[PDB]
Structures are given as structure tokens and as C-alpha cells.
């Protein structure tokens, strides 16, 4: 499809709601979404990161994440266009699929 | 376990500073940025380090962006560096140089 395109106001309006519904928020002074995750222990946390990592490979899109033991803070944004794109939404949805099937 | 003494810092930190580790200015911890070929390598690195972190029961404060991995080490139980930080750092260097 060429290079990613920053989401249009129409797209944002129809794709962001489901993600804010479950904790994602837009960062201030930057076009990106973020969410803090908490698990039982580092092991779970890294199992989570590992699964997400494998999907990140299939998508060729990677997260901006920070990990401290059982916490994993994730920030998503597309560098090519300096903002949110399908990719971010795509990866976020998969991340929710995983962070939910571990409760 | 316990916070390193001025004597221990003097005999354990040098080898790590030699290869890039630095002390934070304002917090008792060491830091170092790592860069790799791609995310895959980067995550392979983090995975190996993660397994050792489990054996040590000591974990890093790390941030990853694609091929970059910034690591900060410190021990919360004693408010500062400890044998565990130095131990983990040394293992991290073995893996990074192994790259």
C-alpha cells in the first residue's frame, strides 16, 4: 500500500473509541496512544511481551514499551507518518487480545 | 541483598564504566543504551537477559524502541546498587558482546 498514512479524523472517530473503552489514551503533545499494563510477575509480563513481539514481527510494526518487573507501559505510533495509522490500531487490538487471555 | 559500599563500588563499577555503563546523576543506578541490527535481534537479546533475570530474581528497568534497548539497573529493596545489579550487568555484557 506504499507507506502508512496518518489516520483521518473519520478513521480516528471510528477506530479509537473501542481502544479508549479499554484504557488506551492519546498522549499530549504527540499523536500516539498509550496504556499501562500490570501482571502477576515479571514472568507473566515477559510472556505477554513475547507474544506481542511475535505479532509485531508479522506486522512489521513495533511498540515503544517500558518494562519494570510486572508492569509494561506501551506507546504506539507510526514513525513513517509521525502519527497514528492502521498499524497502531491493528497492533493495539492484538495486544488487547493477549492481555485479556491471561487473567 | 545489600547496597554496595564505597569500597565495592570502587572495585566493581570500573569494568562496567569501561564498556559504557554510567551512573545516573541524581539516583543510585547504572544505565546504558544498546543498539542492534533489528527488533528481532533486540528481542532475542532481551529474552536471554530475561531468563538470567529470572535466575537472579533481579530485573532490569528497560525501554525498547525497535532495535534500541535502554537499560537501567538498581535494587529497590536496598535503595541503590547491589551485587545483583553488577551481576546482571556483567551477564548483559556477555550477551551483548555475543551479538
Amino acid at each position: 500500500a506504499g507507506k502508512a498514512h496518518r489516520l483521518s479524523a473519520e478513521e480516528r472517530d471510528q477506530l479509537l473509541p473501542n481502544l479508549r473503552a479499554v484504557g488506551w489514551n492519546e498522549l499530549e503533545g504527540r499523536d500516539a496512544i498509550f496504556k499501562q499494563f500490570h501482571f502477576k510477575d515479571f514472568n507473566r509480563a515477559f510472556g505477554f511481551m513475547t507474544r506481542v513481539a511475535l505479532q509485531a514481527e508479522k506486522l512489521d510494526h513495533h511498540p515503544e514499551w517500558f518494562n519494570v518487573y510486572n508492569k509494561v507501559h506501551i506507546t504506539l505510533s507510526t514513525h513513517e507518518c509521525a502519527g497514528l495509522s492502521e498499524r497502531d490500531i491493528n497492533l493495539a487490538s492484538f495486544i488487547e487480545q493477549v492481555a485479556v487471555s491471561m487473567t | 541483598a545489600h547496597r554496595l559500599s564505597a569500597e565495592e563500588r570502587d572495585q566493581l563499577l570500573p569494568n562496567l564504566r569501561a564498556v559504557g555503563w554510567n551512573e545516573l546523576e541524581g539516583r543510585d543506578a547504572i544505565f546504558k543504551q544498546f543498539h542492534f541490527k533489528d527488533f528481532n535481534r533486540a528481542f532475542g537479546f532481551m529474552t536471554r537477559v530475561a531468563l538470567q533475570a529470572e535466575k537472579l530474581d533481579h530485573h532490569p528497568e528497560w525501554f525498547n524502541v525497535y532495535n534500541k534497548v535502554h537499560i537501567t539497573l538498581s535494587t529497590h529493596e536496598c535503595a541503590g546498587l547491589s551485587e545483583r545489579d553488577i551481576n546482571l550487568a556483567s551477564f548483559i555484557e556477555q550477551v551483548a558482546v555475543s551479538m
Binding site: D41, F42, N43, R44, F46, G47, T50, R51, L54, Q55 | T47, A50, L51, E54, K55
Partner: peptide, 27 residues
């Protein structure tokens, strides 16, 4: 296996990787 090594294996399968193709690639 340690708790973490299990996670890595688990996730390694759930990524759509049959134990077969895994054991094969292994060894």
C-alpha cells in the same frame, strides 16, 4: 522448566507454531 521458560514455550506455540515443526527445527 522455570516459570518463565514455560511462558516462552507457550507463547512460542500460540504464535501458530505446531509442536511438530518445533521439535523438528529443534535437535
Amino acid at each position: 522448566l522455570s516459570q518463565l521458560q514455560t511462558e516462552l514455550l507457550a507463547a512460542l506455540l500460540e504464535s501458530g507454531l505446531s509442536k511438530e515443526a518445533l521439535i523438528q527445527a529443534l535437535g
